[PDB]
């Protein structure tokens, strides 16, 4: 009940308390480990919201005082009134900060603190969202020079006028499905591409048409607006040593910035909170490109590079791999656009855990997705033990909204 | 109930039914996942339990559940626990029970193979000298001049606890460490602690890179004794790599066979704490881990700087770039040398095909993801994108604390 955890390349070991506060389920049991599973009333509403005044009023040093009681009382009325309650912008700022401290699945939470909050509970309408978004994209970007921030729309209320961005990021690459059978563009992106056309997006047919964004004010049905063309920052793909890299015509966007997640504070829940930070190079270079269901072409830059592909033990994936990752970093930094490589990234991740460790008792942490898709043995993250559970205020997971909405 | 579990590349679903059967805890709870924690004496009373779950098991899988042969052997150990508070297998009871820890064994890639596996069953073995002998045999059957075969030798199970057999190393086979006074590491420096020992036991060290360990073997609860392996029965690889003419002059080798010697195999409640068990390598084994985690042979540097990598910024990946040519390496010397080894993406491959018939054959595959997945290139694999259930079957082989923290010295 108070855990250890090593380090087994540095033997450091760590004693982990903060995990006794947990909220939430694992999915995990005695009996099995799920650990690998991507997706594993007035009543409640009282004790989840003195559970997060608490830790508000704990964490400014005034627990306890006339200030915490006047306030929790305050809650309290207004949910027996009103059965809801609203936030303070202070109570806001600090729980979307900690719901980002909670990620258990995020590397870059050293940044944690440094989180530009936009408060947008007062948008009432699809237009209002896109303005705010549009800001929000502007602003995170800096010219290159990448802020970290959230946008948070108005909060449930009866789950029949949810604001929900339909789109899983803000910046994706549409996806289509050829005559010729394959698929052109982003095969992740097929299904909300054809329901984009479908609410009469007029496609461009190419391989890195940014989609639309497609916004749900207070449980309307969701519209269509195209991002401003200039404010999408993004990166042409050149290799340093590869002349030939740029033909592959390859391009990634500056921002990544995720739409479809629920934040809960206090249990009030945004079900619409895009926000964003900036890419670790793996997620493009590994993952974006090199998946065999994404843009998958790990074959053309081996062929390109006249590797042995007849046999598997030649590494031939392998070392094309590496060379699409060293490009991903390469234009990134020449077009001084902010990125991270995954050293870099989990050394400081080694470095947030360790204060995490000592100035709050522990650090959840998923090792299964924190450790990056290439090279993990090599990053010092692997070599960390990392004990998972759930805090809150935190970012879930929650259904596509096609499945959900009536239209 | 079922669960399932999902191929996000392939959207291929299976579901898990096997997972019923399991017993042994995980370390995990509805609150905590312990998924990524390397760890997380017995009554007569809690043993024909045991017992009884395995021959059930076994006598299944013969398609004689419930025969007169069935309800004879669970009557004859039955009288035999509570006579001598403890059973002896059968050979064919034993076969299976290993066969099935290594079928049940959720962090090895390699179980495509499990039913291929020899058993040499040293359950007459009574001294560290018989113990020596019977490994040795391991050690020549099993390496088979570089075209390795599996195998496990089994040896006397535990009694009270007073009289266990061990095998003092980790694995048959590793280079000794030796620590400087000017606090570098020559050699292994994950075997620094337990070349100390062999050397307090009177090991005289040759003090080299590649020095192969001695055995200390403990026979019957005695105090252990060293014993040399004869070194051509030590098959060895000196690394080179197929373009690079300098790669030979970093002076590396490595041995062919990967043998466990320090964990425990429990097969119906009984205890082998001696099972030294061995397969072949998977090339990241050595490429990744041995000779390039920080805290072991440690290579990246001097290889990145003979590739004249530009090593001033980590973005340049300079360090991914010379793993990959060290597990190019690697691979290459095995083959070229006819010594059996296997790279990642075929282990991982016939891995996930012998996971599916698994699930359709037995309703189940438990598997450690954290294990499974390699430590290089992890997601251009296809273990990296296959959803897997952790749970823990029996017969197994598990960890056991290292036998000099628990030796009662006879002197
Ligand atoms: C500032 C730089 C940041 C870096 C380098 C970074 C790094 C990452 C990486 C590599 C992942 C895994 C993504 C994947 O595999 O698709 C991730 C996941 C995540 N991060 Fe971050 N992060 C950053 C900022 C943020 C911010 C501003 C937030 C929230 C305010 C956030 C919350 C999350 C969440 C919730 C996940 C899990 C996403 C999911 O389940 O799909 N991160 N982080
Ligand atoms: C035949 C070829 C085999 C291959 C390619 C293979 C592959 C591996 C690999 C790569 C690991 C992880 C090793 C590590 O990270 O240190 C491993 C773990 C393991 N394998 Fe195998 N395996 C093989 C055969 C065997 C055999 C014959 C047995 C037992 C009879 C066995 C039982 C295990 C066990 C118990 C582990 C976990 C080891 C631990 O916790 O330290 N495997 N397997
Ligand atoms: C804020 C932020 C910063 C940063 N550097 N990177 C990100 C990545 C976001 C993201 C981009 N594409 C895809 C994803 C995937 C999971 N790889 C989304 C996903 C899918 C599924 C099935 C489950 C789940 N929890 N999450 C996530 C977000
Ligand atoms: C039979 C077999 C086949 C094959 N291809 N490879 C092997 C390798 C075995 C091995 C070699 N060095 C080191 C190990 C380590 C865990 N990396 C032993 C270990 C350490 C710790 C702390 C826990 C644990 N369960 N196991 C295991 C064995
Ligand atoms: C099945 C497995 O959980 C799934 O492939 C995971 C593995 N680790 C991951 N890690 C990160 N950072 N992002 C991911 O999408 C995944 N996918
Ligand atoms: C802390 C973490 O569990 C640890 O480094 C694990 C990760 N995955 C591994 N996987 C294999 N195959 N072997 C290992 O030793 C480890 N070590
Ligand atoms: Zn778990």
Same mark, same amino acid.
Not at 202 to 212: I, Q, Y
């Given at each position: ?132 978004? @549009? ?153 974006? $490109? @090199?998946? =065999?269901?994404?843009? =998958? ?91 998972? $559970? ?12 096609? =499945?959900?909405?009536?239209?």
């Amino acid at each position: 009940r108070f855990l250890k955890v090593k380090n087994w390349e540095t033997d450091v070991v760590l004693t982990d308390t903060l995990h006794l506060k947990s909220t939430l389920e694992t999915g995990c049991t005695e009996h099995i480990c799920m650990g690998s599973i991507m997706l594993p009333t007035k009543d409640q509403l009282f004790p989840l919201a003195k559970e997060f005044l608490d830790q508000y009023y704990s964490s400014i040093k005034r627990f306890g005082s006339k200030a915490h009681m006047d306030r929790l009382e305050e809650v309290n009325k207004e949910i027996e009134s009103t059965s809801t309650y609203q936030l303070k912008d202070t109570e806001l700022i600090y729980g979307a900060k900690h719901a980002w401290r909670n990620a258990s699945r995020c590397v870059g939470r050293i940044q944690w603190s440094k989180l530009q909050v936009f408060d947008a509970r007062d948008c009432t309408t699809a237009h209002g969202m896109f303005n705010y978004i @549009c800001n929000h994209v502007k602003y995170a970007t800096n010219k290159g020079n990448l802020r970290s921030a959230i946008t948070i729309f108005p909060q449930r209320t009866d789950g029949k006028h949810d604001f929900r961005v339909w789109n899983s990021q803000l910046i994706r690459y549409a996806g289509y499905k050829q005559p010729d059978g394959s698929t052109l563009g982003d095969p992740a992106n097929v299904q909300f591409t054809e329901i984009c056309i479908q609410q009469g997006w007029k496609a461009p047919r190419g391989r890195f048409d940014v989609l639309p964004l497609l916004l749900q004010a207070n449980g309307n049905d969701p519209e269509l607006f195209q991002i401003p063309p200039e404010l999408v920052l993004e990166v042409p793909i050149r290799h340093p040593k590869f002349d030939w890299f740029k033909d592959l015509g390859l391009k990634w966007y500056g921002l990544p910035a995720v739409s479809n997640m629920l934040l809960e504070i206090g249990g009030l829940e945004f079900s619409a909170c895009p926000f964003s930070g900036w890419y670790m190079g793996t997620e493009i270079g590994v993952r974006d $490109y @090199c998946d =065999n269901s994404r843009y =998958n072409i790990l074959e053309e830059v081996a062929k390109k590079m006249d590797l042995d592909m007849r046999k598997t033990s030649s590494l031939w994936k392998d070392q094309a791999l590496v060379e699409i990752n060293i490009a991903v970093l390469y234009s990134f930094q020449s077009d001084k656009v902010t990125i991270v490589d995954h050293h870099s990234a989990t050394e400081s991740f080694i470095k947030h855990m360790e204060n995490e460790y000592r100035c709050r008792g522990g650090c959840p942490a998923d090792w299964v997705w924190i450790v990056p898709p290439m090279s993990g043995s090599i990053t010092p993250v692997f070599h960390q033990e990392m004990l998972n $559970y759930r805090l809150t205020p935190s970012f879930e997971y929650q259904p596509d909204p096609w =499945n959900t909405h009536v239209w």
